[model samples]
Target: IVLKSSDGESFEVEEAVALESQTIAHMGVPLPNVTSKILAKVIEYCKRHVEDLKAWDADFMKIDQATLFELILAANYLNIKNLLDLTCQTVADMIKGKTPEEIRTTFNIKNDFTPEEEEEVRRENQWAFE
Candidate 1:
């Protein structure tokens, strides 16, 4: 298969397994698509659908949130359902048993509201504060 990344890098993947991308099931340049960095990881994940995929999946999901989020969008538009499922699981695992504040911190969210404004939101959803 011939794949080209958003940044104009070409990938020669002979394995039709790259067809795992249903979006790609038809067809690359696949321009404003995915970056070379993200596509490289996507290629790696694409080739690893066999032989205890779960084992390698653990390590593959170790990328920082920056790349992880990028991978999410990449998988999304690519229609690569397996990548979507796995990426969703990783984000889900992060939220399990964590407070919203912790989750916000995990995602580097800034709380720029005034104290009164913060309390206003908390007032609207009292249980959220609890």
Candidate 2:
């Protein structure tokens, strides 16, 4: 079967591999929201899943945060259950035990909130910071 990426790249893959994405498994099949780069990674993930094991899955996720987030979006958009699970879990692990500032630094996000506004939300949900 062939999966075409948004950038018009063609990927010839096994039916079993393509079917991992429920969207493709259904009558509807396309990758408009997925780019060649991300779709290629998506195909690699599906191939690895049907062919082998988990250790490789771990190393497969060792990509830049930008790419990781895109995979999450693609997994969700494509309705690939296990890929969505894996990508989301990786994000959860990255955020574990990290302070708000620590997480901001990790993801290179700016602190857009003022101290007073931030304090109210923190105060409102103090338990989350614990």
Candidate 3:
């Protein structure tokens, strides 16, 4: 039977499909109470991509920058292997010749690190972060 969140969000997931995530499968984790809006977003992701997962593999790297990070996190949490790999590859392509500011802006990530902290981090992992 499908599980419904306390706020009336329903997740009609298959047992075998949910088992794709070892963390969830091993723990037998019960659904946490969450807002219907957030649950709907998650459910929407699963419904839209689950069926075309394999077909989407070839075009995953071609996903536009607008939703690239969103797709990455969604793919990771959902344990969609091909999507995860493609998102990662897309991210790599994005940063190949881009500036740090460009990368941050493109991904919609805030520059939380202070100037000093940013310098330190860059110095520490210059090759990797750059």
Candidate 4:
């Protein structure tokens, strides 16, 4: 199916992939029902993943952690379950078997919580690290 963004960008995606989103389905025969901004974001994800599926190697899918997280959110917002799952699994693998400190260091995550709050969360999930 072909969708056009308000900015005039056009996206070509498989009908099934688009149908994955109920919003897209509900847009019915007349499009422009889904906001152009939303459709653009959804198209970006679909286009990237479509390339990923066709590529010889997935190294092209290696996006930075923060970007990957953003993409996951976009996928979820677009109701693209498979893309959401794939990005979530990628993040999970990136943190797998890593300590909280290690994860913080690896991702350069600012420790926003107060020390006490940080410790509380750490304590809650401590066993997972052990």
lDDT (10s digit) by residue, model 1, range 1-130: 6777877888866456656888777664353668888877877667766226567778888898889999999889988888898898888898899877898889888868898998898788986644
Worst 10 residues of 2 by lDDT: 23-32
For all candidates in order, the CA lDDT equals 0.78, 0.83, 0.59, 0.63
Model 4, 26-83: lDDT tens digits are 5613343344545555565555555534462256346666666656665665666777
Best of the two (1, 3) by TM-score? 1
Error of 1 at 100 (Å): 1.9
TM-score of each: 0.77, 0.81, 0.45, 0.57
TM value for model 4: 0.57
Q: Rank the candidates by lDDT, best first.
A: 2, 1, 4, 3
Q: How accurate locally is residue 60 in candidate 2, as Cα lDDT from 0 to 100?
A: 90
Index of the highest-TM-score prediction = 2
- TM-score: model 1 vs. ground truth: 0.77
Q: Residue pairs in steric clash, candidate 4?
A: none
Tell me how candidate 1 scores on lDDT.
Answer: 0.78
Error of 1 at 56 (Å): 1.5
